[PDB]
DNA sequence: TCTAAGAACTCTGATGTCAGTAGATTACACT
């Protein structure tokens, strides 16, 4: 638990090739080696949600949520002191930051795996998260046909 | 006994402007 919270908190690097390596430690550090996780999801929100139109620095929480997804899909936001009605909204809202590809599109790439999880685990949140996604993409449909 | 210098108005042509489009240039990056 102390390892994962540290490895994820300090994951960033100013050099893309190094940052990509720190991230790749996490991928095997979960999927090859721990059930014993208590995944640090209260961090993960802060690692993406801080709004600014020219942020690149939202992107790490996108990529990192993509690691905690891709390891055969543990659940998201169980009882971690944060509200699903705010948490997922930001995670969609990220795809408004159209200045940089890895900021906006990678959020959609994660969400297209989240639906595949929640729908196949038959949980109720796809009744809302599908509406969060649908509501935001409509804002592009009328204004930014390419994005 | 009248012939130009001074008006006046419209019109034409270039220069600069704004918004929007999209190309080519220039950085960024690979272990």
Curated annotation (Swiss-Prot):
Disulfide bonds: none annotated. It is found in: Nucleus; Nucleus, Nucleolus; Cytoplasm, Cytosol. The modification N6-acetyllysine is found at residue 47. Autophosphorylated at two clusters, the T2609 cluster and the S2056 cluster. Autophosphorylation induces a conformational change that leads to remodeling of the DNA-PK complex, requisite for efficient end processing and DNA repair. S-nitrosylated by GAPDH. Serine/threonine-protein kinase that acts as a molecular sensor for DNA damage. Involved in DNA non-homologous end joining (NHEJ) required for double-strand break (DSB) repair and V(D)J recombination. Must be bound to DNA to express its catalytic properties. Promotes processing of hairpin DNA structures in V(D)J recombination by activation of the hairpin endonuclease artemis (DCLRE1C). Recruited by XRCC5 and XRCC6 to DNA ends and is required to (1) protect and align broken ends of DNA, thereby preventing their degradation, (2) and sequester the DSB for repair by NHEJ. It is linked to Immunodeficiency 26 with or without neurologic abnormalities: A form of severe combined immunodeficiency characterized by reduced or absent T and B cells, recurrent candidiasis, and lower respiratory tract infections. Some patients show dysmorphic features, severe growth failure, microcephaly, seizures, and impaired neurological functions. Belongs to the PI3/PI4-kinase family. DNA-PK is a heterotrimer of PRKDC and the Ku dimer (composed of XRCC6/Ku70 and XRCC5/Ku86). Formation of this complex may be promoted by interaction with ILF3. Component of the core long-range non-homologous end joining (NHEJ) complex (also named DNA-PK complex) composed of PRKDC, LIG4, XRCC4, XRCC6/Ku70, XRCC5/Ku86 and NHEJ1/XLF. Additional component of the NHEJ complex includes PAXX. Following autophosphorylation, PRKDC dissociates from DNA. Interacts with DNA-PKcs-interacting protein (KIP) with the region upstream the kinase domain. This is DNA-dependent protein kinase catalytic subunit. The chain holds residues 2213 to 2359 of 4128 of the full protein.
């Amino acid at each position: 638990n102390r390892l994962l919270n540290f490895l994820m908190k300090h994951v960033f690097h100013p050099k893309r090739a190094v940052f990509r390596h720190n991230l790749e430690i996490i991928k095997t550090l979960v999927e090859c080696w721990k059930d014993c996780l208590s995944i640090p999801y209260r961090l993960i929100f802060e690692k993406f949600s801080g709004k600014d139109p020219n942020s690149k620095d939202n992107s790490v929480g996108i990529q990192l949520l993509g690691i905690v997804m891709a390891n055969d899909l543990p659940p998201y936001d169980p009882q971690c002191g944060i509200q699903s009605s705010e948490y997922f909204q930001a995670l969609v809202n990220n795809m408004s930051f159209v200045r940089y590809k890895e900021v906006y599109a990678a959020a959609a790439e994660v969400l297209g795996l989240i639906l595949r999880y929640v729908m196949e685990r038959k949980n109720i949140l796809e009744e809302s998260l599908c509406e969060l996604v649908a509501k935001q993409l409509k804002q592009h449909q009328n204004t930014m046909e390419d994005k």
